[PDB]
Structure formats: C-alpha cells, structure tokens
Write a protein that holds these residues in place. Structure first.
Motif, PDB file in Angstrom:
ATOM      1  N   UNK A  41      10.308  35.219  -2.796  1.00  0.00           N
ATOM      2  CA  UNK A  41      10.973  35.133  -1.543  1.00  0.00           C
ATOM      3  C   UNK A  41      11.043  33.251  -1.481  1.00  0.00           C
ATOM      4  N   UNK A  42      11.673  32.744  -2.321  1.00  0.00           N
ATOM      5  CA  UNK A  42      11.880  31.435  -2.366  1.00  0.00           C
ATOM      6  C   UNK A  42      12.599  30.570  -1.401  1.00  0.00           C
ATOM      7  N   UNK A  43      13.225  31.242  -0.524  1.00  0.00           N
ATOM      8  CA  UNK A  43      14.250  30.516   0.394  1.00  0.00           C
ATOM      9  C   UNK A  43      13.303  29.943   1.391  1.00  0.00           C
ATOM     10  N   UNK A  44      12.085  30.427   1.563  1.00  0.00           N
ATOM     11  CA  UNK A  44      11.233  29.776   2.597  1.00  0.00           C
ATOM     12  C   UNK A  44      10.537  28.298   2.294  1.00  0.00           C
ATOM     13  N   UNK A  45      10.687  28.047   0.907  1.00  0.00           N
ATOM     14  CA  UNK A  45       9.484  27.076   0.332  1.00  0.00           C
ATOM     15  C   UNK A  45      10.311  26.022  -0.089  1.00  0.00           C
ATOM     16  N   UNK A  46       9.661  24.861  -0.558  1.00  0.00           N
ATOM     17  CA  UNK A  46       9.879  23.506  -1.096  1.00  0.00           C
ATOM     18  C   UNK A  46       8.794  22.937  -1.761  1.00  0.00           C
ATOM     19  N   UNK A  47       9.208  21.864  -2.548  1.00  0.00           N
ATOM     20  CA  UNK A  47       8.087  21.042  -2.916  1.00  0.00           C
ATOM     21  C   UNK A  47       8.303  19.643  -2.168  1.00  0.00           C
ATOM     22  N   UNK A  48       7.131  19.103  -1.864  1.00  0.00           N
ATOM     23  CA  UNK A  48       6.841  17.878  -0.765  1.00  0.00           C
ATOM     24  C   UNK A  48       6.361  16.961  -1.698  1.00  0.00           C
ATOM     25  N   UNK A  49       6.643  15.590  -1.629  1.00  0.00           N
ATOM     26  CA  UNK A  49       5.893  14.526  -2.315  1.00  0.00           C
ATOM     27  C   UNK A  49       6.044  13.236  -1.510  1.00  0.00           C
ATOM     28  N   UNK A  50       5.427  11.867  -1.825  1.00  0.00           N
ATOM     29  CA  UNK A  50       5.817  10.760  -1.134  1.00  0.00           C
ATOM     30  C   UNK A  50       6.514   9.923  -2.353  1.00  0.00           C
ATOM     31  N   UNK A  51       7.459   9.145  -1.596  1.00  0.00           N
ATOM     32  CA  UNK A  51       8.214   8.273  -2.669  1.00  0.00           C
ATOM     33  C   UNK A  51       7.782   6.909  -2.907  1.00  0.00           C
ATOM     34  N   UNK A  52       8.315   6.253  -3.929  1.00  0.00           N
ATOM     35  CA  UNK A  52       7.562   4.874  -4.146  1.00  0.00           C
ATOM     36  C   UNK A  52       7.684   3.886  -3.099  1.00  0.00           C
ATOM     37  N   UNK A  53       8.403   4.225  -1.907  1.00  0.00           N
ATOM     38  CA  UNK A  53       8.083   3.270  -0.629  1.00  0.00           C
ATOM     39  C   UNK A  53       7.199   3.882   0.472  1.00  0.00           C
ATOM     40  N   UNK A  54       6.617   5.072   0.032  1.00  0.00           N
ATOM     41  CA  UNK A  54       5.532   5.503   0.938  1.00  0.00           C
ATOM     42  C   UNK A  54       5.856   6.601   1.864  1.00  0.00           C
ATOM     43  N   UNK A  55       7.140   7.237   1.749  1.00  0.00           N
ATOM     44  CA  UNK A  55       7.686   8.409   2.542  1.00  0.00           C
ATOM     45  C   UNK A  55       7.551   9.719   2.190  1.00  0.00           C
ATOM     46  N   UNK A  56       6.926  10.366   3.024  1.00  0.00           N
ATOM     47  CA  UNK A  56       6.837  12.057   2.795  1.00  0.00           C
ATOM     48  C   UNK A  56       8.440  12.451   2.325  1.00  0.00           C
ATOM     49  N   UNK A  57       8.710  13.263   1.481  1.00  0.00           N
ATOM     50  CA  UNK A  57      10.060  13.601   1.036  1.00  0.00           C
ATOM     51  C   UNK A  57      10.095  14.974   0.489  1.00  0.00           C
ATOM     52  N   UNK A  58      11.034  15.753   0.959  1.00  0.00           N
ATOM     53  CA  UNK A  58      11.069  17.054   0.272  1.00  0.00           C
ATOM     54  C   UNK A  58      11.938  16.786  -1.148  1.00  0.00           C
ATOM     55  N   UNK A  59      11.485  17.449  -2.171  1.00  0.00           N
ATOM     56  CA  UNK A  59      12.294  17.153  -3.190  1.00  0.00           C
ATOM     57  C   UNK A  59      13.597  17.987  -3.325  1.00  0.00           C
ATOM     58  N   UNK A  60      14.576  17.374  -3.818  1.00  0.00           N
ATOM     59  CA  UNK A  60      15.959  17.837  -3.931  1.00  0.00           C
ATOM     60  C   UNK A  60      15.959  18.646  -5.141  1.00  0.00           C
ATOM     61  N   UNK A  61      16.455  20.004  -5.204  1.00  0.00           N
ATOM     62  CA  UNK A  61      16.663  20.546  -6.380  1.00  0.00           C
ATOM     63  C   UNK A  61      17.858  20.382  -7.241  1.00  0.00           C
ATOM     64  N   UNK A  62      18.760  19.818  -6.761  1.00  0.00           N
ATOM     65  CA  UNK A  62      19.854  19.490  -7.607  1.00  0.00           C
ATOM     66  C   UNK A  62      19.781  18.140  -8.636  1.00  0.00           C
ATOM     67  N   UNK A  63      18.823  17.333  -7.965  1.00  0.00           N
ATOM     68  CA  UNK A  63      18.650  15.824  -8.738  1.00  0.00           C
ATOM     69  C   UNK A  63      17.593  16.049  -9.748  1.00  0.00           C
ATOM     70  N   UNK A  64      17.515  15.221 -10.856  1.00  0.00           N
ATOM     71  CA  UNK A  64      16.543  15.030 -11.973  1.00  0.00           C
ATOM     72  C   UNK A  64      15.377  14.543 -11.085  1.00  0.00           C
ATOM     73  N   UNK A  65      14.070  15.013 -11.458  1.00  0.00           N
ATOM     74  CA  UNK A  65      12.951  14.641 -10.697  1.00  0.00           C
ATOM     75  C   UNK A  65      12.787  13.091 -10.916  1.00  0.00           C
ATOM     76  N   UNK A  66      12.973  12.814 -11.923  1.00  0.00           N
ATOM     77  CA  UNK A  66      12.833  11.299 -12.501  1.00  0.00           C
ATOM     78  C   UNK A  66      13.477  10.419 -11.809  1.00  0.00           C
ATOM     79  N   UNK A  67      14.829  10.911 -11.083  1.00  0.00           N
ATOM     80  CA  UNK A  67      15.685  10.046 -10.491  1.00  0.00           C
ATOM     81  C   UNK A  67      15.324  10.298  -8.741  1.00  0.00           C
TER      82      UNK A  67
END
Length: 368
Positions: A41-67
């Motif tokens: 039931x993946x539609x409810x979920x996401x991966x959350x991280x902090x970006x190199x500028x300190x901001x909480x962000x949800x991961x985009x599934x379309x883009x490279x993780x390295x990008x």
C-alpha cells in the motif's frame, strides 16, 4: 567507475542499510525499501530526508537520489513514513504491515504531544497499545511491573493527575485486561480508529495570512482544507472540503484554490517561504487526488459506532475525575474542554465550518 552510495532507511520499527548507485532514482530506492519490508500500500508513504542546506524534504521518485542535494554524510539518512492518511482507517487499510506502520507513527505523535489527546482517550489508547504489544493479559505471565519500561501516556496527562507511576501502571493493567480476546492487529486497528477522531489527527499545519495580514494556520488533510486562528490549532473556524476544490497552485507567496462551481470565487491565501509552499502544493494535490480516486474509480466517531469503546471512555472519565489537578491544564486542554462543554467534536465542527456557499466562507476568511 561509479562510486556506490551508502544509504540508511528507517521505518517506525526497522532499519535498512544498503548501497545505491549514482544513477539510482528515488523510485528505485523507494521500491527496494517497500519490497524488503513487504509493503504494498505504497500510495500513503514517502522517504523523508534533510537537504545540504538543512531543510526537511520529501524525496522525489523521479529524480536521481544523487541529484537531490541530500545532506552529505556516510551513510545518507532517510526516514520511511506515511505522508498521507486514509479518510477512514477502518474501511481503507489492507495489510497488517501498513496498519502497524500507521499505528506506530500515530502513537509516536500522541506520546510526544505533537498530536493533542485528552486524558481519558490517552489512557484508553495506552491500554490498546499494551494489548497490541503484549497480547492477552495473563496474571501469571505479566507480573507486577511489566509496564515499567512503557511510554504509556503523554507527559501532560501525567502532570495533571495526582497519580504515581505505579498507579498509572495499575490503572492501565486493568484496562489491558478488558481487551482479552482481541488480536494484536485488531488492537492496532482499534487504536487508530480511536485516534482518528482527535482534533489534530492527520493534519499538516502551515503558517498563512489572509489579505489583511492576519496570522492564521492552514490545515491540510485527507478530507480537505481547514483554517485556524493563531492560538487554537484544535478548532478549525472555516473549511473547504476537497469535493468543492477544482485545482490548487501558487506563485511566489500567493496560493490560489479554484472551485468546482465555476461561479464561485477563488480561495486565496499567502505563505512566505518557497520551500514550504512546494510542500503545501504536494500535500494538497496528493490528498485531493486520493480523495477523488475513492469516489470516482455523515462522519461519526468510533465511540458512536462502537458502544463498548464509548462506555470505556466514559468509565475512564469517571475514574480520572477525582485525581484531576485543575491548575495543571494546558492551553490545548482548555480549548478542548470548552469544545466538549458546548457538545462539539471533530465531525460536528467540520460540518459546521463547511456550511454556507464558497463566497460566504471566503468572506469570513478575509474578515478573520
């Protein structure tokens, strides 16, 4: 040769540690996670991280993780969490694992007091969580003190009753015993059904302003959009259900929400930060899409649907009255109590603030 990237992903109760590649997309990382845990039931979920500028962000599934400018560290750190909630937990959740991850995440919010919860509800929830973890209470297995390591209730609830920790444990044990026969999974479900009636359950709050600059809160949830006054996050004052909303967009600081009824006016509000605004848009469109999918392939409380739970809550009310310390109430306690004194609850209030046509509610909004 591409350098592997070490990642660590935590769910509410597990950790996963593996390597991805420079060309690995968010979707590929996301798929590896859900497959490993058996979650579908993946539609409810996401991966959350902090970006190199300190901001909480949800991961985009379309883009490279390295990008996606994830904070540089070895390993990269992600949290797998529910981003969206079902409208009705009882009718919608399918898998045990899905139910568990929601249960754990909601319980963390209640215990930390991120999600306000009144005393009697808090205690009853505590006893359902105990049933989930321990199974049926057995006097010959669960000797005195078996609850000594548990986070049973929010600190606020403990602060306002004249009970010792041992008394709290005695009281929760009695209720644990009441749930004899209930499967752990159904205890987790009952917990969610009770929690979903809470004022703050499932809501993301954002600082906004109306035209004349009044500070307000926007609440985004599975049912629609709520407006709150600055010092009361429990009681929405104005509401726009998803059924009335055509689209959502923003530009700079200005949000424009267009109506299904083309003759109705636009709902317009302001929010100051670009990064936060991108997240508001995502949450709006996401909740809107799920809402629409449910319908095009009168809400009551769990207490009102479930006579037994209703009695349990009122029995706890009577049980906690003597021990109550009236000088220890918090601001949110006071708001909640006044709503209760007037006979209100989440759904009555939701229907109330949604009356009148779109223009009347927008006019009220601009007047706040």
């Amino acid at each position: 040769m591409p350098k592997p990237i070490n990642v660590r992903v935590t769910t509410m109760d597990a950790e996963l540690e593996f390597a991805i590649q420079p060309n690995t997309t968010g979707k590929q990382l996301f798929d590896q996670v859900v497959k490993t845990i058996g979650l579908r039931e993946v539609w409810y979920f996401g991966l959350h991280y902090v970006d190199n500028k300190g901001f909480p962000t949800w991961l985009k599934l379309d883009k490279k993780v390295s990008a996606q400018e994830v904070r540089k560290e070895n390993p990269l750190q992600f949290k797998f969490r529910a981003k969206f909630y079902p409208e009705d937990v009882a009718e919608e959740l399918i898998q045990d694992i899905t139910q568990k991850l929601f249960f754990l995440q909601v319980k963390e919010g209640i215990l930390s007091d991120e999600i306000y919860c009144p005393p009697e509800t808090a205690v009853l929830l505590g006893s359902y969580a105990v049933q989930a973890k321990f199974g049926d209470y057995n006097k010959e297995v669960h000797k005195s003190g078996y609850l000594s390591s548990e986070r049973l209730i929010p600190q606020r609830v403990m602060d306002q009753h004249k009970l010792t920790r041992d008394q709290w444990e005695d009281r929760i044990q009695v209720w644990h015993a009441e749930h004899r026969g209930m499967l752990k999974d159904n205890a987790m479900l009952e917990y969610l059904k009770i929690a979903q009636d809470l004022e703050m359950y499932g809501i993301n709050y954002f600082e906004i302003k109306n035209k004349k600059g009044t500070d307000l809160w926007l609440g985004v949830d599975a049912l629609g959009l709520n407006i709150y006054e600055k010092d009361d996050k429990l009681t929405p004052k104005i509401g726009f259900p998803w059924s009335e909303i055509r689209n959502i967009s923003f530009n700079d600081k200005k949000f424009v929400i267009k109506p299904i009824d083309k003759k109705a006016p636009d709902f317009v509000f302001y929010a100051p930060r670009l990064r936060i605004n991108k997240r508001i848009l995502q949450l709006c469109m996401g909740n809107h899409e799920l809402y629409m999918r449910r319908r095009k392939p009168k809400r009551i409380t769990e207490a009102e649907k479930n006579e037994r739970v209703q009695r349990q809550l009122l029995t706890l009310s009577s049980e906690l009255s003597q021990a109550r310390d009236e000088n220890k109430r918090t601001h949110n306690d006071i708001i909640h109590n006044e709503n209760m004194r007037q006979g209100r609850d989440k759904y009555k209030t939701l229907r109330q603030i949604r009356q009148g046509n779109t223009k009347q509610r927008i006019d009220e909004f601009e007047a706040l």
